[PDB]
Amino acid sequence: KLPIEETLEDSPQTRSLLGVFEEDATAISNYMNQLYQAMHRIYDAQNELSAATHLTSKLLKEYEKQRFPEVMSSTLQQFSKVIDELSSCHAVLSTQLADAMMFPITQFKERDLKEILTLKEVFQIASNDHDAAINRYSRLSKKVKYEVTEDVYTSRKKQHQTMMHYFCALNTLQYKKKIALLEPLLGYMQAQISFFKMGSENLNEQLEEFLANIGTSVQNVRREMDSDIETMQQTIEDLEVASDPLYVPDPDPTDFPVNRNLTRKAGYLNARNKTGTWDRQFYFTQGGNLMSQARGDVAMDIDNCSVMAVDCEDRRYCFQITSFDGKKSSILQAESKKDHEEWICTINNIS
Amino acid sequence: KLPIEETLEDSPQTRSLLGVFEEDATAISNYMNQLYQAMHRIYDAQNELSAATHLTSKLLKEYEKQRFPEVMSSTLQQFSKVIDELSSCHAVLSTQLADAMMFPITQFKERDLKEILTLKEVFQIASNDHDAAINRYSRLSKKVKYEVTEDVYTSRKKQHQTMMHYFCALNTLQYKKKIALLEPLLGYMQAQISFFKMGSENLNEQLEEFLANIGTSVQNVRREMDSDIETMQQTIEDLEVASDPLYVPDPDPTDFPVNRNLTRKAGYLNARNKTGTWDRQFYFTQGGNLMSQARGDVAMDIDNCSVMAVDCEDRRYCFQITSFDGKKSSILQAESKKDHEEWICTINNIS
Numbered sequence: 001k002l003p004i005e006e007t008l009e010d011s012p013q014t015r016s017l018l019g020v021f022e023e024d025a026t027a028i029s030n031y032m033n034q035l036y037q038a039m040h041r042i043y044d045a046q047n048e049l050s051a052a053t054h055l056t057s058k059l060l061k062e063y064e065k066q067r068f069p070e071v072m073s074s075t076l077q078q079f080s081k082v083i084d085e086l087s088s089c090h091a092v093l094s095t096q097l098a099d100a101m102m103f104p105i106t107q108f109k110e111r112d113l114k115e116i117l118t119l120k121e122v123f124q125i126a127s128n129d130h131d132a133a134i135n136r137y138s139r140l141s142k143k144v145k146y147e148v149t150e151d152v153y154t155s156r157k158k159q160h161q162t163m164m165h166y167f168c169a170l171n172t173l174q175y176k177k178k179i180a181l182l183e184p185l186l187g188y189m190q191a192q193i194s195f196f197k198m199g200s201e202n203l204n205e206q207l208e209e210f211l212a213n214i215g216t217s218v219q220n221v222r223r224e225m226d227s228d229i230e231t232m233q234q235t236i237e238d239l240e241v242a243s244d245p246l247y248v249p250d251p252d253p254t255d256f257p258v259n260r261n262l263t264r265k266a267g268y269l270n271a272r273n274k275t276g277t278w279d280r281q282f283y284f285t286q287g288g289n290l291m292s293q294a295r296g297d298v299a300m301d302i303d304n305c306s307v308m309a310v311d312c313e314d315r316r317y318c319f320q321i322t323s324f325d326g327k328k329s330s331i332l333q334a335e336s337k338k339d340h341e342e343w344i345c346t347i348n349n350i351s
Numbered sequence: 352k353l354p355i356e357e358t359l360e361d362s363p364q365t366r367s368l369l370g371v372f373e374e375d376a377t378a379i380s381n382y383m384n385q386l387y388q389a390m391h392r393i394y395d396a397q398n399e400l401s402a403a404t405h406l407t408s409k410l411l412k413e414y415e416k417q418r419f420p421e422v423m424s425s426t427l428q429q430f431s432k433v434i435d436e437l438s439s440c441h442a443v444l445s446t447q448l449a450d451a452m453m454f455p456i457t458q459f460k461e462r463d464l465k466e467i468l469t470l471k472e473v474f475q476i477a478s479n480d481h482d483a484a485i486n487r488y489s490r491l492s493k494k495v496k497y498e499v500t501e502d503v504y505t506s507r508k509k510q511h512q513t514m515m516h517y518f519c520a521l522n523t524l525q526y527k528k529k530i531a532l533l534e535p536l537l538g539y540m541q542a543q544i545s546f547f548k549m550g551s552e553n554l555n556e557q558l559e560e561f562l563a564n565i566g567t568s569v570q571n572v573r574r575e576m577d578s579d580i581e582t583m584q585q586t587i588e589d590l591e592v593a594s595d596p597l598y599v600p601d602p603d604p605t606d607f608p609v610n611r612n613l614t615r616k617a618g619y620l621n622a623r624n625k626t627g628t629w630d631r632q633f634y635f636t637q638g639g640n641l642m643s644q645a646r647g648d649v650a651m652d653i654d655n656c657s658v659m660a661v662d663c664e665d666r667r668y669c670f671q672i673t674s675f676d677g678k679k680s681s682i683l684q685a686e687s688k689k690d691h692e693e694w695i696c697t698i699n700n701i702s
Contacts, residue, residue: 027419035407042404046400048399049396049400056389056393068375069375082540138629142667153599154598160591168583168584172576176576179573182565182569182572183569185434188434190562192437200547211540218534221526221529239358240512247503247511249500282362296363335488
């Protein structure tokens with residue numbers, strides 16, 4: 001395209017046919033860089049997709065490894081098995097795209113396009129040097145006549161070599177653009193056609209069934225749920241209105257009679273008369289035994305019951321009692337006069 | 352799973368069965384958040400892939416819109432046509448994944464899982480308030496007896512409602528985990544199966560042909576290129592050794608004789624004797640006309656030739672001449688005694 005055998009003369013016409021090419025390269029670099037970055041966003045996003053698909057399959061396979069205080073586990077494995085074969089599709093694709101698309105387009109924008117700019121710069125440097133040389137030469141008069149001529153020799157010779165190679169690259173660039181544009185696109189497509197092929201291979205109907213199946217089990221699970229929430233919202237309503245008259249320690253004496261025939265009393269009580277501060281704790285009758293249990297500690301014995309009677313008294317508080325079958329016990333305190341009676345009556349009832 | 356009708360008594364055993372569930376929720380949130388972020392990386396990377404594929408197809412379609420100073424264009428359109436149908440596959444998939452995968456998993460981790468923490472906090476607040484209430488009550492002696500009892504009423508009632516709803520959510524959470532885990536996965540897969548189906552529809556053999564075709568045209572283009580570079584590297588060698596004895600103004604007089612029979616001389620020359628600085632410019636004989644042309648300006652006339660003789664002289668420079676057919680011209684300067692003669696001889700030859 002660019003004639004090398006026209007570089008020596010270096011005519012203005014020639015220098016114009018260098019501009020066209022040069023302008024063409026500016027355009028070509030601009031278009032090509034745009035395509036480069038788009039393909040770059042493709043590649044990156046593709047690997048990132050590949051990686052996330054893998055991590056998902058990974059997590060899925062660790063369900064049966066979680067500390068959980070069965071159809072599910074077996075389920076999360078087939079999904080893990082199907083999502084794993086897919087990851088590989090993506091993993092495979094990302095590799096091809098890296099080798100068949102990115103690399104070529106990346107070398108065109110790092111080697112080829114650069115050399116054009118590297119050469120243009122060296123030629124515009126050799127060109128200028130000669131320019132200066134010629135003037136000096138011109139201003140001679142009638143040895144500085146050697147040195148000054150020598151430079152024309154050197155600068156000129158440098159501009160001839162420089163412009164030629166430059167011309168060479170610019171021509172070559174003509175073949176390269178066609179390739180640096182078709183090659184990548186061809187690779188991308190071939191990559192894709194193999195991607196959809198491999199992926200379709202694992203997406204058969206025996207899977208579509210499995211999927212449909214679960215899709216009904218989940219709707220099944222959702223029905224169950226909506227059903228259980230309905231009966232719960234009512235329970236809470238029911239119990240919310242029935243309990244209100246019980247949130248208060250001493251309830252209406254006429255509607256909630258001190259039951260004096262219990263063979264089992266259960267509830268929290270405060271223990272022992274030693275400030276320096278008592279200790280709250282749940283208590284409950286049990287096979288002639290009075291068991292106790294602090295706030296979430298998971299049910300130990302405290303006193304045995306085959307004891308005759310049980311006094312009371314206080315320490316300035318209210319509703320206290322005390323057992324003394326074996327030797328005695330600490331002083332227990334109730335929260336109401338009802339509670340207080342039922343504690344004394346139930347235990348005495350316990351014989 | 353959690354019994355609501357056991358909340359009023361609030362026994363230590365019950366409070367333990369709340370821990371299990373609570374521990375289970377801590378685990379469940381941890382596992383589920385991990386799955387959430389993985390699916391998030393999937394979704395994002397998927398849309399990003401979708402977008403880059405589109406932009407690529409877009410750029411491709413703008414080739415015939417670039418300022419370029421034919422099989423190619425038609426080619427870049429089919430690729431653009433095939434890559435565009437693919438973008439839609441990705442575009443379609445990204446939408447499904449957003450609606451069928453992200454949203455569900457996102458609401459489980461923003462609504463459901465949160466409510467558990469919101470409730471646990473309110474219950475641990477109602478629970479503590481009652482705790483304090485009970486003590487005050489206990490320290491009464493023998494109206495502050497009303498206010499102090501009232502609080503037990505309020506704090507207790509608040510703890511009963513709070514714990515119940517909490518129990519309710521924790522149970523519901525049991526159904527939800529199954530769903531917030533299966534639903535997303537099902538959507539993702541259905542999305543995928545439709546993705547590969549739609550994509551395969553456009554990847555037929557008439558395309559595989561088109562691809563194979565180009566793949567040979569490009570190798571064809573690459574052959575051509577490698578071939579042209581071979582003949583160029585030689586040309587440059589050839590011309591590099593032939594030219595060396597010509598880079599110097601006045602070449603060997605014995606090997607490059609002052610040709611005095613030229614009917615055409617061409618080369619740069621300096622013009623007019625007016626410092627205040629000459630002007631370099633290419634000159635060339637042309638149909639009895641002496642044309643001139645500056646550094647890249649694209650070829651104007653200057654003097655006519657049918658002029659008798661042509662003197663010379665200087666202005667302190669060297670190798671100058673002057674024409675005077677019409678009226679006269681500026682003083683031209685050559686770079687050598689050879690150049691100088693050939694300019695004077697060629698023009699005189701031009702009659």
